[PDB]
Paper text:
To determine the precise structural information of the novel coronavirus SARS-CoV-2 N-CTD, we solved the N-CTD structure at a resolution of 2.0 Å with X-ray crystallography. One N-CTD monomer is composed of three 310-helices, five α-helices, and two β-strands, with an additional N-terminal α0-helix in the partial electron density of the traced molecule. Two N-CTD monomers utilize three regions to form a stable symmetrical dimer, with a buried surface area of 2618 Å2 (of the 8026 Å2 monomer surface) (calculated by the online PISA server). First, the most distinctive feature is the antiparallel four-stranded β-sheet that has domain swapping interactions between the two monomers. Second, residues F346, L353, V350, and I357 of the longest α5-helix form multiple intermolecular hydrophobic interactions with residues T329, M322, and I320 in the β1-strand. Last, the α1 helix forms a strong hydrophobic interaction with other monomer α4 helixes, like two clip-bars, to firmly fix the two monomers (i.e., A264-S312, Q260-S311, and Q260-Q306 interactions). SARS-CoV-2 N-CTDs form repeating cylindrical high-order structures with six dimers, which is slightly different from the SARS-CoV N-CTD octamer X-shaped high-order oligomer pattern. The dimer of SARS-CoV-2 N-CTD is shown as a cuboid shape containing an α-helix-rich side and a β-sheet side. The electrostatic surface suggests that the α-helix-rich side contains a positively charged channel, whereas the β-sheet side is a neutral surface. Nevertheless, the conserved positively charged channel of the α-helix-rich side is thought to be a potential RNA binding site in the SARS-CoV-2 N-CTD.
Author numbering:
A (entry chain B): 250 to 364
B (entry chain A): 257 to 364
Write the structure that this text describes.
């Protein structure tokens, strides 16, 4: 999958065991446009991760990405970039709210705790 | 239906699904009057949607945070997506995105 999955625009890629989060989206890190999400289990597995559906329930649809987010455009020496920022509210009345918080905390900035 | 999974259409438009356009943190700023009224029925929706991230890429590319605020618990996200200037459609993609970014500021 790697050679062919890598053919897609970055924002359309799907990470898997055969093409993991690092190969698709770069090493995790603190920099302003590095991704910071994923512990070692998610990084090596991507959408093969056992709880990927419980994570993906927070990812936005295309309509919601463009309806919810603050969208910008920056023209720089490296090219033309679409910038995005936003926030998705967790439903504290969802019976699984506490598990969702635990799941997100499991992966946010997790790279800080391993090489 | 969780806000992040909604899909806007002429019958259930961007305002109805996602709120009025505006400048504040949890408000969206994207879409002129036509896009707001039509959502994914907008004539150039597929050309906009090609920049929306897959679920894998949203969590792979973005800086993700979680915050408790005076209104509750939020997942925050930021990132940047590079347009492909080798794409013959590049010039039109820039025009299209530029047309909708902060369009509400000039609503007549």
């Amino acid at each position: 999958s790697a050679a062919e999955a890598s053919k897609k625009p970055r924002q359309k890629r799907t990470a898997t065991k055969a093409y993991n989060v690092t190969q698709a989206f770069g090493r995790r890190g603190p920099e302003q446009t590095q991704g910071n999400f994923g512990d070692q289990e998610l990084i090596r597995q991507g959408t093969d991760y056992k709880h990927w559906p419980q994570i993906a329930q927070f990812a936005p649809s295309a309509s919601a990405f463009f309806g919810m987010s603050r969208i910008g455009m920056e023209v720089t020496p490296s090219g033309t970039w679409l910038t995005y920022t936003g926030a998705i509210k967790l439903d504290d009345k969802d019976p699984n709210f506490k598990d969702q918080v635990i799941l997100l905390n499991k992966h946010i900035d997790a790279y800080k705790t391993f090489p």
